[PDB]
Amino acid sequence: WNNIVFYSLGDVNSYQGGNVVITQRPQFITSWRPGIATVTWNQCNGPEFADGFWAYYREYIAWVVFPKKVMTQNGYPLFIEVHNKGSWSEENTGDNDSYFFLKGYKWDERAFDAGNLCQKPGEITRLTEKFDDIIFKVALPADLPLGDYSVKIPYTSGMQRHFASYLGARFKIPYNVAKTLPRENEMLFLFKNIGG
Numbered sequence: 001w002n003n004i005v006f007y008s009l010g011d012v013n014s015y016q017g018g019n020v021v022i023t024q025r026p027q028f029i030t031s032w033r034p035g036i037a038t039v040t041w042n043q044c045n046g047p048e049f050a051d052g053f054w055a056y057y058r059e060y061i062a063w064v065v066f067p068k069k070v071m072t073q074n075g076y077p078l079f080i081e082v083h084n085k086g087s088w089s090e091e092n093t094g095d096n097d098s099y100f101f102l103k104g105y106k107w108d109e110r111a112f113d114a115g116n117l118c119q120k121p122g123e124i125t126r127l128t129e130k131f132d133d134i135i136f137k138v139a140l141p142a143d144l145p146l147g148d149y150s151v152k153i154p155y156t157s158g159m160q161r162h163f164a165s166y167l168g169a170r171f172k173i174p175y176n177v178a179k180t181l182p183r184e185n186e187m188l189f190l191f192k193n194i195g196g
């Protein structure tokens with residue numbers, strides 16, 4: 001059997017880009033913040049609870065799905081580009097609308113730990129793991145009005161936890177499903193367009 005549960009993080013953060021001109025590509029840093037996660041998706045055909053007497057195997061993969069474009073409040077498109085993905089595995093690069101970053105750091109790990117191996121959507125748990133930052137840069141359209149900007153950029157980040165009854169178990173949430181997961185995180189990108 002295989003049980004996979006996606007635990008979604010949902011913090012809001014700000015990044016000050018300062019004064020910028022439309023010929024520049026201001027950057028912003030997206031950091032992974034340990035916190036409370038909410039199940040937003042699962043797929044299970046195994047047992048619901050492990051009572052401590054039985055073994056199962058863990059495969060954990062961190063995910064970040066980030067938009068390639070975002071509209072400003074006043075109606076202008078900002079183009080998001082990856083500047084430094086750190087150790088993240090940037091995949092499904094052909095998608096026109098979103099970046100997909102994954103970090104599979106645990107696999108084939110046998111455990112007897114008691115717990116709920118298929119929490120339902122809405123359930124929560126605390127994620128204490130830390131992952132690398134991702135630095136993005138933004139291209140501003142030349143026709144962007146001058147002034148202060150506070151751009152809300154929704155995105156998904158979370159932990160895919162896969163429990164299985166056997167060794168060598170592998171599962172990755174399909175990109176097409178991931179792209180649709182609730183985007184509970186928010187980067188609030190601030191900057192003042194002084195021209196150019």
Ligand SMILES: CC(=O)N[C@H]1[C@H](O[C@H]2[C@@H](O)[C@@H](CO)O[C@H](O[C@@H]3[C@H](O)[C@@H](O)[C@H](O[C@H]4[C@H](O)[C@@H](O)[C@H](O)O[C@@H]4CO)O[C@@H]3CO)[C@@H]2O)O[C@H](CO)[C@H](O)[C@@H]1O
Binds near residue numbers: 060089090091104106
């Ligand atoms: C679908 C698939 O399995 N392979 C694709 C691959 O998928 C892996 C990728 O998304 C990474 C990103 O971190 O996470 C998963 O794998 C983890 C580790 O990162 C990876 O190093 C490790 O590999 C070990 C393998 O499992 C062992 O059997 C082997 O003996 O030793 C290897 C190295 O130590 O595996 C884990 C698995 O959880 C994903 O599985 O991504 C690429 C890039 O897109 C491509 O699609 C592959 O087909």
